[PDB]
Design a binder for these strands. Sequence first.
DNA 1: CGATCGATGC
DNA 2: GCATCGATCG
Length: 556
Amino acid sequence: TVSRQKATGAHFTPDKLAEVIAKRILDYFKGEKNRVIRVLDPACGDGELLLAINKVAQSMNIQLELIGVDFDIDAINIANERLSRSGHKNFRLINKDFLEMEELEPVDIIIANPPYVRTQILGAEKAQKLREKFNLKGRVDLYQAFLVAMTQQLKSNGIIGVITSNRYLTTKGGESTRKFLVSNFNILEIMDLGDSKFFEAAVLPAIFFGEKKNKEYQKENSNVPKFFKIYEQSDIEASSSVNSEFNSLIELLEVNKSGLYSVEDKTYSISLGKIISPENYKEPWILATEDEYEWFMKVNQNAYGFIEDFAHVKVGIKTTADSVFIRSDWGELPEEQIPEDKLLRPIISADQANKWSVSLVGNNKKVLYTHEIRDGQIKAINLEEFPRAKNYLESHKERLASRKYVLKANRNWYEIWVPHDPSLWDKPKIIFPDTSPEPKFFYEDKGSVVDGNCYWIIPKKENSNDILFLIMGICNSKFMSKYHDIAFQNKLYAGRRRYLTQYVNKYPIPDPESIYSKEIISLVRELVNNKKETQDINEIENRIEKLILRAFDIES
DNA sequence: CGATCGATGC
DNA sequence: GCATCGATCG
Ligand SMILES: Nc1ncnc2c1ncn2[C@@H]1O[C@H](CSCC[C@H](N)C(=O)O)[C@@H](O)[C@H]1O
């Protein structure tokens, strides 16, 4: 199920992309450049990065000592053959685990593309060892441990050029990585390659260039960190101009002017600017232009608060066996195994998501809910009281009992892993999908369950009314989409944002007592009650955009 | 406990 | 194309 390429992260850097990284490294290198420079690739694969940096260095008449490490002998054998045939004799390859889970003196240059292996593939046990050894936190990825490991092999004032997944820039679990990078390096440049798809794998990579700090120093300050951001721009503004003077996508990585660029069948939006105070490592690092960052600043100052202050942003249920607990064909089961109607709760998924109004006009999904309120406490149901539902779960005994995290928690083998509080489903709530290219927050007061591909919003104050309607009008607006693309830059392919709790908690909210917020609430109340409204919903939506702009005191 | 994260995945 | 869904961590 898990390929050897998946578990070992064996994806080689393309030809032209490796050359781009090598050119930027040797341009940033302030070292001597007339002696032998030692270069390290801590996961060299077939030697692609070492070949690229030597080809560039030989043009500059620089002599390199190439060092490559890889724990796979097959990669070492092919890299030895390629390096030997290149003509360069001063190279050295080591077959070992670089993380050390027999010596090497520090190097002047590191060029790297470490493997990206998620915590689930590493396993919980190996992930704990990596966190304890390399001082990492959260859902650690392998490239994060390599980042710490390879940095400790770099001389002070040495240059690093390393390409990884861009997810440390915006995820909560990237906090330890951001802290380590800004602490150990004078950040030279961060390149967010976005959804350009240089690799055959579905990944959005970032390239980090930095000069390792020396323990004795100055103020630096003469170095201000810059960024380069390129994403696929599908929709083009009617008044925006496109530059088509570049032939290949790899040439766009060396442009030095922000704007729209078209290569073949796709248009790209390239942004250049400065990293703004990366020492604040607890929030995502924002890569935005001067105008975008200033607009982002004035919204926060004029904001009355944030969603986190007014409501609980929760995830839907996580059964950890969706094809067993969530079905639409309950009536088509054998009558001996059709669960009792008390247990089958209608559940809303992401494929029924629209703005304001739910697409519940066509739905039949129900969840076999396994929890209930008993003596004022949340307890799992007793199977003896539900014979038909018991037989159904008996047929799935081996798979449901395989969930080791359920048994080590001393919970019943048949339970839903995250059922939440059964009493909270009755409250009015906002629902929205996680993976979506557009906000689809909608009101729902029929007391149904929310699926794991959606999040839901319930107020902190027990007045489940106007406050939810205000939050909807804010979240669904184009105003908040602009704010989102600046502050929370976590994108999947095809322009999909991630509407996660850690992001939606930070949405700004205006004063719910101002006359502007009062009119927004009345318009949102109309959009959910008047399902006879069609097409001219856009008319109401436009009135909300101008109201939100006056509520935050800005014209965008 | 309850939200995260995805060299996405099928 | 286009929207995971289940191990995981705190
Ligand atoms: N623990 C470890 N120690 C050393 N190498 C490792 C490793 N885990 C994975 N690798 C190696 O890291 C490589 C990542 S693919 C990167 C290859 C090369 N850097 C390039 O850009 O083309 C794989 O070949 C894999 O064999």
